[PDB]
Each structure stands twice: as structure tokens, then as C-alpha cells.
DNA sequence: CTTGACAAAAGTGTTAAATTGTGCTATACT
């Protein structure tokens, strides 16, 4: 069971009081500055050796082995960084352990405040995430608030974390819920509007109107800007939604297929494609083969007058009159045979 | 559950390596560990102390 | 079947306005 799971996993590891807390944060910052210290040792970026710590800490072969088909492999772009600073005197080799223990302590403090992160996401439900999702992204917000925290400021990490958890959650909302991607600001304004509506509803004792609701919204807020985006907001509809009151009918089964031309159109189109071929043969060998090049009948791409006149050796003028006369000259055959007089839609 | 192994000159292992009875710990070959388990290297207590363990 | 001339439609390019994606917020809050 996934529900009870996480709860019983975090309930295993205890919390942290001021002692452990302050200490842990100090350990982390010491490891960080230790990295910056060793960043000048071999000339490696503070972020580089930082992740190089992960290689032997939160997994051996599992951190870099599959971040896709390519990443920073253990033998190639890792090993030469693991056994590089590996030969340095005391004044260097010590910062290694400072970074080891700092890096571990980081994850530690995180695990300690996890019993909070979960209890945080509890209010943020209903977002299209049943708990565990919300909690996960919240845990990410914790990871953020972790490396950005400062113990020196004598602030309880429980305060700093919350403001970031609420962030990584309220952010995950817009990037998950609506089936159609709805950008952050969009949803922001949505919640703003819906808040105003759901508020003045009780105030006026009834529902607002696009004019009066957008009125209390601000400048440039007409009936349109609210009613317009109101459409966007609305999510799609499950094709499994039952239609009628009887248990048979499905939603999706009630939708047509206009994507593919209907058989009646297969013959309707294949008919014109021919009937226009036979009524075409009454044209001169020039004014016909040319009359096709201007309709995209030949190579399927349309050939402008300029090029047609280059193909027949004539001029950008001659082809022009050729089309005119050749065309109406067919209009006579059409108006006299009534074979094609349909297709007038 | 563990055994302490104090040192003087640096160490040949980081925090968490897998050792075995008769392996080189620290001090450039002086102090050796007689038992399995991950080696938790401490700076302040100056000890290469190895906790009884089996990498499973 | 044709030449020069020439409106309209179409094209190449820069900039302005608009849209979209991110990072933070520290009393404490498990």
C-alpha cells in the first residue's frame, strides 16, 4: 500500500531539535565551503567535485549509470575526477571528508524535515494530485530550501522550508492538473478571478456578470477578457463519460470521423478527377498541359505564370491570355453538356 | 558495534569504503584493519574506525 | 503570340508588444 507506505517510512526516522538542526546546517555549509576550497586544488568547478561526492555517497553505480543514454559515466568523465584529487597532502585530503560528511548531513536534515513536508502538502490536495504526488514535489521544494537555508540567521528551518514547499507545490499545480498545458500566470489570474467571483457571490446574494466581476478585477478587464480565458481554463472531457441515464452509452462512441474522407467522397472526388480529364482533352496541346500547371494538377505544386512562360518558350503575357481563353472555351462545353455542372457545393 | 583504529598521517580510505581483515587503513601502511565492514573515517577523533558489516 | 508599364499580392527584415518560464519569500508551522 503506497498511502501508508511513505508515512511509515518517514515515521521511522525521528525529527530534529535545535541542537541537531543547527549542527546539521553547519555541517552542510562546511562541506559546501570545503568544496569551494578544493575547487582551487585541482582547478575543478565547485559544482563538479560536488556531484563527484555523490559517486560514492548516495549510490555507487546508480547515480550516473542511467540518466539517459548519455551523462557523466563512471569510467570516463567521473573516474579521472575521483582519482585526481586523490593524491594531495593533509591540508587538502581533509576537505574531502568535510565534503563527505557535509553532503551526507544535507540529505539527513532533509529526511528529518520530511515529516513536515508531508504534513504540508495535506492542505494543498484537490489539485489533481492525490497526496503522494503533492508530497513528492514538496520534497523537491524541501531540497531547494535546504541548500538555500542559512543557520547563521538564527531562523528555524521549519519556517524557511514551508515557504519553499508551498512554492514547489503551487507550481506543480499548473504543470500537472489541466490536461491542456496552461502557463503559470494564466492559472494565477484564473485563481484571482475565480476568487473574486466566489467572493462577491455571497456579497450580492447571487452570481455576478462578466461586466461586474471583471469590474472588481482591474483595468482592461471587460466581459471579454474574463469570458475568453474562462474557456481556456476549462479542461477537456473524458470520453468515458456516460451519456444519457442508461448503462450502455459512452461519450467517445458518440463522435464522428471526418478525418478520413467518406466513401461517398472517395467516389465524389475520383469522379471529378476524371470528368475534368475528359472535358480537358478538347483543349489545344498547349492550353491544356499549361492549364494544368497553373492549378497544381501536374507536379502537384502550382507553377506561376513566370515559370510556365519559361517552359513553353513564350512570355509572361502570352500564357496569361492562353489561360483566359482556354478556360472560357471550356465554359462553353460545360454550359452545353451539363456533365460537370454540379459540384457547385 | 565496531573497532577503533587511531591514525597519525592522513588516511588511504574515504568515509564508507569496504574493507577486509588485513587491509591498509591509514598512516601510509601502519594501521591495518582486522575486520570486514564499512570504514567510517573521522577527522576530529583521528580514527579510521571500522564498523562490523558485510556489503550485501 | 508579344513589349513596356505597373497595381496588387507577396517577401525579407527590424522592432515593438505580448507571452511564457523561473526563482524567492526566513517567527514558527513536522
From Swiss-Prot, chain A:
Region (Sigma-70 factor domain-3): 188-266
Positions of region (Sigma-70 factor domain-4): 279-331
Region Sigma-70 factor domain-1, residue ranges: 1-35
Cellular compartment(s): Cytoplasm
Keywords noted in UniProt: Cytoplasm, DNA-binding, Sigma factor, Transcription, Transcription regulation
Region (Sigma-70 factor domain-2): 109-179
Gene Ontology MF terms: DNA binding; sigma factor activity
GO BP: DNA-templated transcription initiation
GO terms for cellular component: cytoplasm
Motif Interaction with polymerase core subunit RpoC boundaries: 133-136
Residue ranges the UniProt entry marks as DNA-binding: 305-324
Biological function: Sigma factors are initiation factors that promote the attachment of RNA polymerase to specific initiation sites and are then released. This sigma factor is the primary sigma factor during exponential growth.
Subunit structure: Interacts transiently with the RNA polymerase catalytic core formed by RpoA, RpoB, RpoC and RpoZ (2 alpha, 1 beta, 1 beta' and 1 omega subunit) to form the RNA polymerase holoenzyme that can initiate transcription.
Family statement drawn from the similarity comment of this UniProt entry: Belongs to the sigma-70 factor family. RpoD/SigA subfamily.
Domain-level remarks: Contains 4 domains, connected by flexible linkers. In the active conformation, the domains are in an extended conformation, each making extensive interactions with the RNA polymerase catalytic core. In the autoinhibited state, sigma-70 factor domain-1 packs closely together with sigma-70 factor domains-2 and -4, contrary to the extended conformation that is seen when the protein is part of the RNA polymerase holoenzyme.
Protein name: RNA polymerase sigma factor SigA
Organism phylogeny: Bacteria, Thermotogati, Deinococcota, Deinococci, Thermales
Range of the intact protein held here: 94 to 438 of 438
From Swiss-Prot, chain B:
Coiled coil (UniProt feature): none
Taxonomy, superkingdom: Bacteria
Protein family according to the UniProt entry: Belongs to the RNA polymerase beta' chain family.
UniProt source species: Thermus aquaticus
The name this protein goes by in its record: DNA-directed RNA polymerase subunit beta'
Protein's job: DNA-dependent RNA polymerase catalyzes the transcription of DNA into RNA using the four ribonucleoside triphosphates as substrates.
Complex formation: The RNAP catalytic core consists of 2 alpha, 1 beta, 1 beta' and 1 omega subunit. When a sigma factor is associated with the core the holoenzyme is formed, which can initiate transcription.
